[PDB]
Amino acid sequence: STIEEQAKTFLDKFNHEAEDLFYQSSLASWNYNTNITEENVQNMNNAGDKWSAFLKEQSTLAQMYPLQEIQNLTVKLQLQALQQNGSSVLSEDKSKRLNTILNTMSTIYSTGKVCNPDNPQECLLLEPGLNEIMANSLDYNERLWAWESWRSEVGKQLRPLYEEYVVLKNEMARANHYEDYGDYWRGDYEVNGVDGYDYSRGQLIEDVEHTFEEIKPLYEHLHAYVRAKLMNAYPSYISPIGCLPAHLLGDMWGRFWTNLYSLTVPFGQKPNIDVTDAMVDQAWDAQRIFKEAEKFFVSVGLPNMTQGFWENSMLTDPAVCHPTAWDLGKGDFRILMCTKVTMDDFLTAHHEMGHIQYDMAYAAQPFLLRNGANEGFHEAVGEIMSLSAATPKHLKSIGLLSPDFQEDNETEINFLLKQALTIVGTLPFTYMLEKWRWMVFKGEIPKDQWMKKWWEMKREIVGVVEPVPHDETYCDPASLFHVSNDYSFIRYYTRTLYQFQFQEALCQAAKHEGPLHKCDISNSTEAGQKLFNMLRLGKSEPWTLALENVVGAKNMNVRPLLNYFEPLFTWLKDQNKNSFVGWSTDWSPYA
Amino acid sequence: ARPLRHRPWYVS
Ligand SMILES: *[C@@H]1O[C@H](CO[C@@H]2O[C@@H](C)[C@@H](O)[C@@H](O)[C@@H]2O)[C@@H](O)[C@H](O)[C@H]1NC(C)=O
Ligand SMILES: *[C@@H]1O[C@H](CO[C@@H]2O[C@@H](C)[C@@H](O)[C@@H](O)[C@@H]2O)[C@@H](O)[C@H](O)[C@H]1NC(C)=O
Ligand SMILES: *[C@@H]1O[C@H](CO)[C@@H](O)[C@H](O)[C@H]1NC(C)=O
Ligand SMILES: [Cl-]
Ligand SMILES: [Zn+2]
DSSP: OHHHHHHHHHHHHHHHHHHHHHHHHHHHHHHHHHSOOHHHHHHHHHHHHHHHHHHHHHHHHHTTSOGGGOOOHHHHHHHHHHHOOGGGGSOHHHHHHHHHHHHHHHHHHHTOEEEOTTSTTOEEEIIIIIHHHHHHOOOHHHHHHHHHHHIIIIIHHHHHHHHHHHHHHHHHHHHTTOSSHHHHHHGGGOBOSOTTOOBOHHHHHHHHHHHHHHHHHHHHHHHHHHHHHHHHHSTTSSOTTBOEEGGGSSSSSOSOOGGGHHHHOSOTTSOOOOOHHHHHHTTOOHHHHHHHHHHHHHHTTOOOOOHHHHHHOBOSOOOOOOOEEEEEETTEEEEEOOOOSSHHHHHHHHHHHHHHHHHHHTTTSOGGGOSOSSTTHHHHHHHHHHHHHHSHHHHHHTTSSOTTOOOOHHHHHHHHHHHHHHHTTHHHHHHHHHHHHHHHHHTOSOGGGHHHHHHHHIIIIIOEEOSSOOOTTOOTGGGSHHHHTTOOOTHHHHHHHHHHHHHHHHHHHTTOOSOGGGOOOTTOHHHHHHHHHHHTTTTSSOHHHHHHHHHSOSSOOSHHHHHHTHHHHHHHHHHGGGSOOSOBSSOOSOO | OEEOSSTTOEEO
């Protein structure tokens, strides 16, 4: 049709101009991150401003091509990305109020500090003070003071702002023909017009709930084991049948149970595998780390890094030192990392180069399709690389471990428990938090029980109980960065499931023998081929199809994650055979 | 702040 042909032409010209402006913005931002200067600040600001204004104009232009008259789905995808009205659908008054609220909540969160009540000029920030307390304190009341002070100082500020934010976001979403803001967020998994691969926004709720039901047994056994350990760590404060008090979970929210490892490690006389000392003994340097990562990716049949990557990357510290993978366009790929010769930075190099490998795979796609299949794909791709790179088999191959090294079962259990505290512990947390936000946006939780329901859900889904009662002046959800800064959260759940799906499939392609957690995909070009068949897609195809390309199934599945942890599950069942498994929601520290 | 290839297109 004429309109579709004109849409294709518009998108082609958009692609050329966007490539140019995006490259300049990416290069300016890279320069600032590599060399902090007022001049590079200015150059970054100029590039970003040109890019954003260009996108504003192109959004208006994209409106001239109604999707109702487009029959090509790829064209439809590109047009929809540019046509999103978003906050612009509101009146300037409501738009302005929403932006003021958003910036205010962000500022409240990032300036949050709590001070010693007996000496008010002694104050602590979230990072490092309060985080240090929540990770390392064994003082029930100090931890309670930090947890409660954070919620009281910050969440109470946020409460009225969050109420108005719900109102305005719901108006924005309904004006874009969604049910509410939560439905609007779940649109990020939607698929239409592809027979056999469709995915509705309501289906995400069902699939998250079903997979969570399936992981409930493993989580209950992990929870019971951790509860038994914590009763030893905080005597007289934890009921044998009750939820875990929310302030004893190793960070400010219990998002991860990572920092509980040293309080729960099964076999503390066995250290965990650390090849840092071997790396230093063999005089490794950052370049060596990244060359080994490149070898790993080549071994499955993927390309080695570009000459421009090796020229332009900052793998050494001269700069913002966050590990990051930059896909600037025009064949320009870089990694920014202040690499140290440590096992963690070796694994992180594998992760970031996984990001880069994904980026290279879909570079040939149209501009707007040069992205992950959905919000969870990119980090899952990154994570599986670390999984393979840390296995004892892999470390033996690169000569960082002795050929006769054999991992005993106690070390294996320690490693899987540490993995579960982070990976499994965060799934009930993430599901429950997003479920609360979904229900709030839906209108299913009145304001006057926002907190009452929050904690009811914390007790029921997460097995976690507030150490002190919180009335509706609190906004405990908003005390976490992602809530106050208006980020969807379910990505951390889906990302997790995806990453084990991927791994299992790849490891089956590599004909891996033994427990899944010991698998290494090195030297398996069949595995690299299966992975690449999804990587090259970008987001040109539904995420369901992209997932099927790797793992042979069209939907999220938790069974691979359960398989990965099955040895730990078996061990935990045996450990818990004289303990309660599960929890009563009735007990509280203050009742 | 750096550019994205999807909305919001310019993150911090
Ligand atoms: C849809 O159109 C495709 C070609 O369109 C052009 O190439 C893609 C990669 C995008 O850049 C798009 O903006 C361009 O206009 C065909 O390859 C495809 O087969 C068409 N769809 C169907 C179902 O045939
Ligand atoms: C998007 O919204 C259009 C009407 O809103 C207009 O465009 C936005 C960007 C604001 O600047 C607003 O002030 C304008 O009045 C609709 O005509 C159009 O169909 C909408 N399209 C979609 C996909 O929602
Ligand atoms: C990969 O292959 C190389 C050479 O064939 C070998 O030295 C290395 O140990 C292999 N690694 C694995 C995990 O098979
Ligand atoms: Cl909380
Ligand atoms: Zn990552």
